[PDB]
Design a protein around this ligand. Structure first.
Ligand code: A1LZM
Ligand code: A1LZM
Ligand code: A1LZM
Ligand code: A1LZM
Ligand code: A1LZM
Ligand code: A1LZP
Ligand code: PGV
Ligand code: PGV
Ligand code: PGV
Ligand code: HEC
Ligand code: HEC
Ligand code: FE
Lengths: 62, 318, 275, 63, 28, 346, 63, 62, 62, 63, 63
């Protein structure tokens, strides 16, 4: 059903919404880029399990 | 005897009331209102219409997805025999991950299905809570029902997620099974001392026994004062009548103190929603702060000490 | 010390037993002869609880228990140090509960209301009586009844439940736990509904019975109504007390094996799925 | 189907699709975690790391 | 490596999707 | 549905709820199952040794001929069932062609070991009972309460599929028909790494920084084993506990202590006597369990829903030939508690 | 069936069909997951990888 | 009883309903064809259990 | 039942609905293409279980 | 039976039949999965693979 | 999508996104915690510390 908002009110809400969604989107994208450069989220074919690459004395939660 | 206000001997039917106008109600209210005469014996005969909201529909769908995940797991557990599912209906469960994963989401059949269903069920319960809130708000009501559900859901999230996370193991979470979640009760209480010695267990049982007490007493009070239209409690709150007066005076002459028509509902609301809240507190402290409620209550002079047995059992492991 | 409207109802009569001698009020409390006897039984029973605290040197509400006699004692009167104090307090508790319910009958007569409240209390009293008499009669002695300790009767509940291995699986326990949970659930729903109707957001008017009906119709498809919610609540709490009666009277007397084994005994063998 | 909103409440449809897609995103992500091959959280190796030939999907390979 | 491409793409998407830049494509 | 009256045994302080109710009608109905056959008259120790008048006699070599024949007839009455002598014997009575012959040789050794070493701590708690062949077998080749590993611990696990109960959540007498872990018998009565002391202790009842307990799953497994114990002895948890304080041995009835030894004894029986029999069995024997395992001994194997096997009938003096010499290095703490010295192979 | 919406509510029909097909899509994906052959998350080999011939479906093959 | 929709409203509902059902039908047929070519849904008389075809060091969870 | 929305309101709703549906659809197709290129979702006839292809020392959760 | 809708609500009948048939399709597909012969998810062999003759259905075959 | 607030309540949409994103931030942070590679609180090593070359994500590496 209709919300009763005018065109001006809808446009104001949309400007604020675009600001919020896109600021959060860019900050989250930069955050995920930083975390991905820290440790890439997705393993290669070799994987990134410690048991498969680290020595035996390196404990892994498996 | 006098009419006991237990059953409505003579039911009257008006036109099927679709409901008070709410935003989206004309479309989202679905189902031709059906009148159950059996339900009319106790309360309102009308069944439906139900609001087909986004939160309600998707919460019901997620509940169905969760139930079907559980049923498919039970089937695959009994070689896809519905006969064996029903034969072992109470025993069968979607088991939680074992401790060796800790907080890791394991493979499906090593407790991963449990975590999957936990996510689905938790999201569906949150959407149902949102439906509770929004259905109350659309009618210009307080969200007290939503917050009672929030207390119950807070306890549920403590049982299933928050406290397993704080302990650091998913095996502390509640298995999805009839007998399995009772076995979880036993395992939690005995692993962590004894919940009979858990004072939040004591208080939650006090509030559950007192929910039964208050809600027996309040239903009895309302049925006794229904001679004076006390069951129409909203009017008795805004326009206090002799039924509310008589209820208050009964309880004042009995206990020395009474409630009002509104404050008895405050009392019952809080006594009920305190069960899951202090329940969550006690369960969370079991395994995070408290390792044994028996030893803890021994330190606090809470646990009774009984007569020393003649010839006690001596631990052969010293 | 008296409600704004209380004096308007404080009339003589309505006594079951007591006439006008005990028909008065002390402060807020109506007394009646059953109030006198309830105070007698309550205070004497608490004095016997204190006597057990003295003889057991247990001055802790949590550690103190009046336990029933030993099983070998049977139905015999026990020494006060060997369960006799529990027997005295059992008589006192039965008398105090019955006197309290009868005083509530008197108050209901005086107010012209139905006797539903003393009836529901009498359902709870019936649980207590059948637990402290029916279980001894079934099992052959006062020692099978639960003791009188704040924490120690919890230990008795623990041990009697674990006598049947896994007490959760007891059918009466399953039904009664469902009924207690449904009672707290329905009390939460009902208190929340009434408060939601009478306490909407600030600036909103108080809603009506139509509002609460359409709230639960929109919410769960069914609204039980003003009368229906109180009838269902009395029914739920009463039925959970009857389930408690059945549970305490069946665990041991009518099943000495595990309740898991009780469930295994019939449910898996139901011929529609036992093949 | 622009006429669907003459008969289906778009507010319900959009909000319900968003709710169900939150639920389904959790379901699918949890399904991937529950898979060894697709659990990026655990980071197991792919069998393609140890295969000398492309397994294919519809490729009619034989042992 | 591939992590470099992923990080660069995420940074580019954040730059393009920043409100000051993403709002330049606002059409009403 | 059950019914009063009950044989009651108050196992703890009054009013604690610590008592056991046993149905007299049920024990009467199981009287055929719970009573050993009438013993044969005592056989003289004077005479030629059985290892001298018989070619292939090794375990019973030190027996007199009359004692040998007495114990052979009793073993036939206890394990052979309706097959009689042919159950373990081919046409040649000195040939171990049938696996039952060699398994019964090891079983005589095991019964001698049990009567010599487990009598002081478990097998003579109430009566100088000990165990015979009939204690487990009850007249049958397969002890009715012998247990095998569940057909889920040995199956290949579909790790990413559906329907894995994790050895729980299924009907099993091994857990007294609870949904508790069904492999608890393997965990505790075969394995030694399992922890039965699952109740938290902490310090002051608190999860102190040094406090390490068991997981909730370990609690599940231990409670499942305890369900098996209660099922086997036809008693509740109160038989051996004030359930309010499971970790408290001082608050537990004496039957807990002997139960403790029974646990270890079962482990002993399973680790040193039952499992090493798998070599003697044929590879595809129908007697073997779904996981290809020999039936192990649990609490129920001797306690066939009875507090004391065969109504505590005394067999130590009655069958001296089933009582061996005490093991010089026997120690009930060397079965997974103080060490694993006496669990051979592990 | 264009007249069905004169007698059958297209609101409930469409909503219930979408809800049921979400539930059924989950059910069918569960059935595939539970199958060793069809669980892509497990990634088990197809038996056809080891058969020397086409099994068929109606091929009426013989041992 | 009657939903109260006119012939035109029912006809346009049915246009959308035909579109939705048949688009889903065709997409599902294509998806099932792809999954069937990937792994035929129905076993032959020989079956498709790995244990019956694999060299028996292949783990079959069946 | 009729929602009461005009043709123009239904058309702007449908414009937004097409935008959201098809933007989410294309983003999800790109995401699934990326995850498929990372690790193809569907195994070959040989499968993609580590036990069948990796050496014995490579632990598999399966 | 076009007059059945004079006395029997067609909306109720159609909704109930569709609901029951959803449950019945689930139940019947479950029955097939339970059957070793008919479980395509497990893919067991047919006994006809090892038969040297047609078993029939009504055929009066003798061992 | 500025027309959406003609039909969808913005206040509830923004409140719901903020609540769901608090929920999802907790869930995703937990998902990192559950992974030893990504649990910064436990601080486990990365396998790349022990790899001789870059594992890649799409690198099509071979053992
Ligand atoms: C191990 C073990 C175990 C157990 C045990 C057991 C046994 C033996 C039994 C039981 C019971 C049960 N429970 Mg239980 N438990 C468990 C648990 C549980 C749970 C969970 C969660 O888990 C849950 C929820 C549950 C609950 C229940 C419910 C239902 C019930 C309770 C309630 C009653 O009863 O009360 C009832 C009670 C009543 C009624 C009461 C009445 C007063 C009176 C008049 C009044 C007056 C008084 C006075 C004092 C005055 C005051 C003054 C002022 C203050 C001034 N659970 C475990 C398992 N279990 C019972 C029965 O059965 O029922 C059915 C019995 O018998
Ligand atoms: C280790 C760790 C980690 C993390 C972590 C964290 C925390 C802690 C948090 C987070 C977040 C968040 N994220 Mg993340 N992550 C991660 C990953 C990820 C991923 C993947 C794929 O992987 C994704 C997609 C994400 C995403 C996100 C969002 C959704 C949010 C935000 C929002 C925004 O705006 O951003 C922004 C946004 C964004 C980033 C998105 C974008 C799209 C793109 C272009 C495309 C896609 C693609 C795809 C999907 C496929 C590929 C894969 C393959 C296999 C190759 N994350 C890791 C694993 N986190 C947050 C939240 O949730 O809040 C609520 C938080 O708190
Ligand atoms: C804008 C606008 C729009 C729309 C619209 C519209 C209209 C108008 C319509 C529709 C539809 C629809 N859809 Mg839709 N949509 C959208 C979307 C969507 C999506 C996304 C996410 O994107 C999705 C996914 C969707 C889905 C759907 C579906 C459900 C449907 C189709 C169905 C069919 O086709 O079938 C077809 C199909 C067929 C016939 C086949 C049958 C089978 C059955 C049962 C099965 C059974 C079985 C069983 C039970 C057993 C199983 C087995 C296992 C072993 C277990 N959407 C947008 C929003 N839409 C239709 C209907 O409903 O119908 C009634 C119509 O009309
Ligand atoms: C392995 C794996 C797998 C699968 C997979 C999946 C997933 C994941 C999913 C699915 C689906 C679906 N499907 Mg399928 N599949 C499968 C098979 C099948 C079948 C058989 C036969 O087998 C059927 C019949 C189906 C069907 C279907 C539909 C109903 C839906 C879609 C819709 C449409 O429309 O399409 C479309 C449709 C279609 C495709 C179909 C229709 C009729 C047709 C022409 C004809 C019929 C025939 C017959 C029954 C006979 C048999 C023979 C044999 C030789 C015995 N599916 C496999 C087993 N999925 C979806 C759903 O559910 O949604 C809700 C999802 O999600
Ligand atoms: C490992 C990992 C993984 C993944 C991952 C993830 C995450 C994390 C997520 C997701 C998603 C999603 N997806 Mg995917 N995936 C996967 C696969 C898949 C599949 C298969 C086939 O397999 C499908 C069909 C899907 C699909 C989807 C959608 C539906 C959603 C949305 C998005 C979109 O829109 O896109 C868009 C769309 C799309 C992509 C789709 C379309 C049609 C197409 C062309 C065709 C079809 C075909 C068929 C079915 C048959 C074949 C197979 C055989 C066997 C050969 N996914 C994997 C397994 N995810 C999301 C959700 O849920 O939301 C809520 C999320 O979060
Ligand atoms: C299905 C319905 C139910 C129901 C219904 C209902 N209960 C009512 C009424 C209605 C309608 C009343 O109308 C009445 C009232 O006035 O207050 C609202 C009342 C009441 N119940 C009370 C306690 C209550 N009730 C519980 C359960 C239900 N109550 C079920 C759920 C529970 C538990 C454990 O669940 C508790 C502790 C008091 C507050 C009050 C009685 C006072 C009294 O007896 O006076 C008498 C005054 C006194 C002081 C009694 C003292 C007597 C002896 C000598 C003192 C020693 C006590 C014992 C031996 C008991 C065992 C101790 C345990 C540790 C082992
Ligand atoms: C499953 C029940 C909950 C889901 C709601 C679906 C109800 C069935 C339905 O909505 O079918 C309606 C008729 O229902 C009818 O007579 C019978 C249904 C009456 C309304 C029932 C509402 C749910 C009550 C639950 C308690 C279709 O008519 P409308 O679309 O209203 O025009
Ligand atoms: C129709 C109803 C009529 C009214 C009830 C009549 C019931 C009893 C009145 C008895 C009159 C006095 C008799 C005193 C005899 C005492 C000596 C004795 O020992 O007699 C006992 C009589 O019990 C007893 O007094 C029972 C009384 C002991 C008091 C216990 C108090 C606790 C309960 C208080 C309840 C208050 C209400 C018999 O018990 P035992 O044989 O040991 O039981 C062994 C069991 O295995 C059962 O076989
Ligand atoms: C919630 C659902 C959970 C559990 C419900 C399971 C089914 C309940 C079965 C109740 C009756 C079986 C008890 C019985 O049949 O036990 C008999 C004795 O029962 C007795 O004394 C009491 C007589 C029966 C009283 C109840 C009827 C024997
Ligand atoms: C399995 C439980 C047995 C049953 C039943 C019977 N016998 Fe046996 N017998 C069995 C064993 C393992 C042995 C070897 C004893 C040893 O100390 O090593 C025997 C021994 C005999 C012998 C002597 C063998 C020889 O060297 O000749 C005889 C003659 C014999 N048994 C006879 C016998 C009869 C007559 C039985 C039925 C009444 C009988 N046995 C039962 C194992 C088992
Ligand atoms: C309990 C501790 C036992 C005692 C004492 C004896 N036996 Fe036993 N035996 C026991 C078990 C658990 C099993 C395995 C049963 C199974 O499920 O496989 C056995 C097995 C045998 C067998 C072989 C049974 C068969 O496969 O046919 C024989 C022949 C046997 N036992 C003989 C035997 C004799 C002669 C004993 C007394 C000296 C004896 N057993 C004692 C458990 C126990
Ligand atoms: Fe009320």
């Amino acid at each position: 059903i209709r919300t009763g908002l005018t065109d001006e009110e809808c446009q104001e809400i949309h400007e604020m919404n675009m600001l919020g969604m896109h600021a959060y989107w860019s900050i989250g994208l930069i955050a995920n880029a930083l975390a991905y450069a820290w440790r890439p989220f997705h393993q290669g074919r070799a994987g990134n399990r410690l048991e498969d690459h680290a020595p035996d004395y390196v404990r892994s939660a498996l | 005897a006098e009419y006991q206000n237990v059953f409505t001997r003579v039911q009257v039917r008006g036109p099927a009331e679709q409901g008070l106008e709410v935003p989206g109600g004309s479309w989202n209210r679905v189902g031709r209102p059906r009148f159950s005469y059996l339900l009319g014996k106790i309360g309102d005969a009308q069944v439906g219409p139900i609001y087909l909201g986004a939160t309600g529909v998707v919460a019901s769908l997620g509940f169905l997805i969760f139930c079907l995940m559980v049923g498919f797991n039970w089937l695959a557990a009994v070689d896809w025999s519905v006969r064996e599912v029903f034969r072992q209906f109470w025993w069968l469960a979607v088991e939680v991950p074992p401790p060796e994963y800790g907080l890791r989401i394991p493979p499906f059949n090593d407790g991963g299905w449990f975590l999957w269903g936990l996510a689905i069920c938790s999201l569906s319960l949150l959407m149902w809570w949102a439906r509770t809130y929004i259905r109350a708000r659309a009618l210009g009501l307080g969200t007290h029902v939503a917050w009672a559900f929030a207390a119950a859901l807070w306890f549920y999230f403590i049982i299933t997620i928050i406290r397993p996370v704080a302990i650091g193991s998913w095996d502390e979470s509640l298995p999805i099974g009839m007998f399995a979640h009772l076995d979880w009760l036993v395992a939690i209480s005995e692993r962590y001392g004894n919940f009979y010695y858990n004072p939040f267990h004591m208080l939650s049982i006090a509030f559950c026994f007192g929910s039964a007490l208050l809600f027996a007493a309040h239903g009895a009070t309302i049925l006794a004062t229904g001679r004076y239209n006390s069951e129409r409690e909203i009017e008795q709150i805004t326009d206090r009548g002799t039924g509310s007066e008589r209820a208050a005076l009964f309880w004042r002459w009995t206990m020395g103190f009474n409630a009002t028509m509104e404050s008895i509902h405050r009392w019952g609301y809080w006594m009920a929603i305190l069960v899951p809240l202090v329940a969550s507190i006690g369960l969370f402290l079991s395994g995070t702060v408290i390792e044994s409620w028996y030893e803890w209550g021994l330190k606090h002079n809470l646990v009774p000490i009984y007569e020393e047995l003649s010839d006690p059992a001596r631990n052969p492991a010293a | 010390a008296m409600l704004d409207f209380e004096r308007k109802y404080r009339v003589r009569g309505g006594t079951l037993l007591g006439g006008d001698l005990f028909d008065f009020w002390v402060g807020p409390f109506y007394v009646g002869f059953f109030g006198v006897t309830a105070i007698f039984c309550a205070v004497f029973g608490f004095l016997m609880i204190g006597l057990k605290a003295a003889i057991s040197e247990t001055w802790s509400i949590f550690q103190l228990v009046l336990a029933p006699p030993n099983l070998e004692n049977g139905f015999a009167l026990a020494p006060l140090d060997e369960g006799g104090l529990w027997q005295i307090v059992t008589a006192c508790a039965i008398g105090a509960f019955v006197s309290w319910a009868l005083r509530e009958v008197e108050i209901s007569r005086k107010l012209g209301i139905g006797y539903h409240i003393p009836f529901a209390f009498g359902v709870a009293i019936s649980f207590f009586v059948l637990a402290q008499l029916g279980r001894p009669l079934l099992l052959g002695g006062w020692g099978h009844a639960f003791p009188y300790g704040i924490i120690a009767h919890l230990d008795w509940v623990n041990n009697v439940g674990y006598q049947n291995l896994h007490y959760h699986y007891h059918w009466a326990h399953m039904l009664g736990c469902s009924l207690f949970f449904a009672t707290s659930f329905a009390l939460a729903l009902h208190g929340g509904l009434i408060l939601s109707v009478t306490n909407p957001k600030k600036g909103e008017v108080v809603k009506t019975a139509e509002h609460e009906n359409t709230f639960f119709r929109d919410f769960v498809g069914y609204s039980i109504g003003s009368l229906g919610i109180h009838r269902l609540g009395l029914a739920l709490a009463l039925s959970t007390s009857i389930s408690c009666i059945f549970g305490i009277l069946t665990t041991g007397p009518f099943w000495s094996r595990g309740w898991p084994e009780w469930w295994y005994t019939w449910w898996p063998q139901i011929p529609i799925w036992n093949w | 189907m622009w006429k669907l909103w003459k008969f289906v409440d778009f507010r319900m449809t959009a909000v319900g699709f968003h709710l169900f897609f939150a639920l389904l995103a959790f379901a699918v992500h949890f399904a991937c975690i529950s898979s060894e091959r697709f659990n990026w959280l655990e980071g197991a190796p792919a069998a393609e790391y140890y295969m000398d030939e492309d397994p294919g999907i519809w490729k009619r390979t034989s042992y | 490596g591939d992590a470099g491409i992923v990080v660069a793409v995420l940074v580019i998407l954040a730059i393009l999707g920043w409100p000051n830049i993403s709002s330049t494509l606002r059409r009403w | 549905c059950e019914r009063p009256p009950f044989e009651q045994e108050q196992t703890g302080p009054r009013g604690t709820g610590m008592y056991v109710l046993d149905n007299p009608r049920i024990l009467e109905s199981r009287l055929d199952l719970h009573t050993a056959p009438e013993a044969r008259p005592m056989a003289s120790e004077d005479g030629e040794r059985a290892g001298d008048v018989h070619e292939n006699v090794q375990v019973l070599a030190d027996l007199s001929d009359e004692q040998f024949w007495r114990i052979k007839e009793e073993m036939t009455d206890w394990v052979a069932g309706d097959e009689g002598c042919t159950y373990c014997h081919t046409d040649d009575l000195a040939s171990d062609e049938k696996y039952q012959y060699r398994v019964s040789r090891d079983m005589i050794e095991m019964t001698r070991y049990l009567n010599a070493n487990w009598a002081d701590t478990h097998l003579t708690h109430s009566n100088e009972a000990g165990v015979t062949c009939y204690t487990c077998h009850r007249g049958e080749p397969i002890p009715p309460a012998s247990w095998h590993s569940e057909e889920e611990s040995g199956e290949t696990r579909f790790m990413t599929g559906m329907g894995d109960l994790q050895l729980q959540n299924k009907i099993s007498s091994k857990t007294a028909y609870t949904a508790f872990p069904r492999d608890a018998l393997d965990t505790f009565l075969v394995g030694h790494e399992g922890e039965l002391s699952i109740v938290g202790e902490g310090e002051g009842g608190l999860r102190t920084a040094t406090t390490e307990g068991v997981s909730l799953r370990e609690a599940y497994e231990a409670v499942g084993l305890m369900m098996h114990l209660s099922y086997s002895l036809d008693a509740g948890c109160t038989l051996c506990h004030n359930v309010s304080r499971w970790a408290s041995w001082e608050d537990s009835p004496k039957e807990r202590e002997t139960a403790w030894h029974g646990i270890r004894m079962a482990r002993d029986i399973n680790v040193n006597w039952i499992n090493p029999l798998i070599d003697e069995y044929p590879e595809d024997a129908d007697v073997l369990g779904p996981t290809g395992d020999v039936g192990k001994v649990s609490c129920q194997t001797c306690h066939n829903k009875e507090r004391r096997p065969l109504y505590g009938e005394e067999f130590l003096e009655l069958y001296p030939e089933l009582v061996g010499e005490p093991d010089p290095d026997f120690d009930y703490l060397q079965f997974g508690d103080l060490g694993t010295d006496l669990l051979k192979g592990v």
